[PDB]
Amino acid sequence: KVYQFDFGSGSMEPGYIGVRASDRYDRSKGYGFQTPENMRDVAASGAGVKSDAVEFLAYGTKSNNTFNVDLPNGLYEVKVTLGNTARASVAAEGVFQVINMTGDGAEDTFQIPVTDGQLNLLVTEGKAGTAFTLSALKIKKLSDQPVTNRTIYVGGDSTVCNYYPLNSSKQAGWGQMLPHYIDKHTFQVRNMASGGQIARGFRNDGQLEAILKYIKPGDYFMLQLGINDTNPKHKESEAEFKEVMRDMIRQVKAKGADVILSTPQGRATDFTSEGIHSSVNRWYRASILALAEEEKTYLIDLNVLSSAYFTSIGPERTLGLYMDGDTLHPNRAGADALARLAVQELKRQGIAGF
Ligand SMILES: [Mn+2]
C-alpha cells in the first residue's frame, strides 16, 4: 500500500504519478489540489522527481491550498521531498508536521493517522518570503489502526532543533541526535523545536498546537527552552516565561502524556580560572527547576550534567563541540554528546521507556 506522487510538469518519473499544479482534486481519481488557482509548476535543481515541483502560493497551517489524497483510514508514513528550498515546514490536517526543513530537495519522514479518509498537506511558512515547494511524496500505510505510535515530542530552540540534511548537517540540535540513543522500536521522535524560539512563541504560534493534536498517554513531551527567552527584545520576563511554561505543561498533561523539562546547557566558554565549566544561572534555569517540582514533571538538568562533561574534557575540547566562533550553538558532535547525556540521565532515573 504505497502511493507515490511526482509533483511538477517538466518530467514524470516511472513508479510515480505525475501531479501538476492544475490537477484539481478529483474524487474519481483520489487526489489533486483543492485550490489549483494558488498552485504553480516550477523547476527544481535536483535529479529525477527532484527536477521539478509545485509551489504553494497560499500557505499557513489552516490554508485550504492543499494537495489532497483519499486514503483508507489508518496510520501512514509520509516521506516528503521538497523543491528548491531556503527554509520551509510541512503542514497536514491543519497543523505543523515537520519544522524548518532546508536546502533544495530536502527530505524527511513522519507518521500521521488518517481518520476522515483523506490527507490534506501543504508546504508552508518556515522563512517568510521564500518559495514553499514540493517535488515528491511517498505515502505508505503502516497500520489499519488510525492511532499514532509511542512518540517523544521535542520542543526547543536552535540548540535543540533539526538541521538539514538530517544525517549530514555540520550543525545540529540534540533533539536531532536523540534517535541515536533511544530504541526506535519503542519511540518515534518528532523534533518540533525551531531556531530562535521562546516559550511564548512555541505556545502561541503553532508548535504546541501541532503536538497537542497527537500527544497522548504513553508519550513524552521533551521541552528545553530558556536561551532566547532571556533576550530583552522579546520582553518576556522570567515570570512570564514561568507562567507560559506552566500552561504548556498542564495542557500536555491534560492529554495524559508526560513532560520532561530540560535546563539548557550554557556557552562553550563558561569556564572559570580553575577550568571548571559553570552555567547554573543561565537561561532562566531557576524557573525550570521550580516548575519541575511545582507541576511534578520529570527533569533532566542538562545544564549541570553537560557542564560536568565539559569540565572533564577541558575548554579546548569543549570548544570543539560548538560551531566555530560560535559559543552558543553546538555542532553535530556537541549535539550528539548532549543527547547522550540526556538519555543517560533518563535511564539513571529509571523513567519508563528508557
Ligand atoms: Mn517530475
From Swiss-Prot:
Residues of the active site: 158 (nucleophile), 326, 329
Statement: the UniProt record of this protein carries the keyword Hydrolase: yes
EC number of the protein: 3.1.-.-
Protein's UniProt keywords contain Signal: yes
Tree of life domain: Bacteria
Keyword field: Hydrolase, Signal
Pfam family, one: AGA-YXIM_GBD
Enzyme class: hydrolase
Molecular functions (GO terms): hydrolase activity
InterPro entries: AGA-YXIM_GBD, Galactose-bd-like_sf, RhgT-like, SGNH_hydro, SGNH_hydro_sf
Matching CDD domains: Rhamnogalacturan_acetylesterase_like
Protein family according to the UniProt entry: Belongs to the 'GDSL' lipolytic enzyme family.
Name listed for the protein in its UniProt record: Uncharacterized esterase YxiM
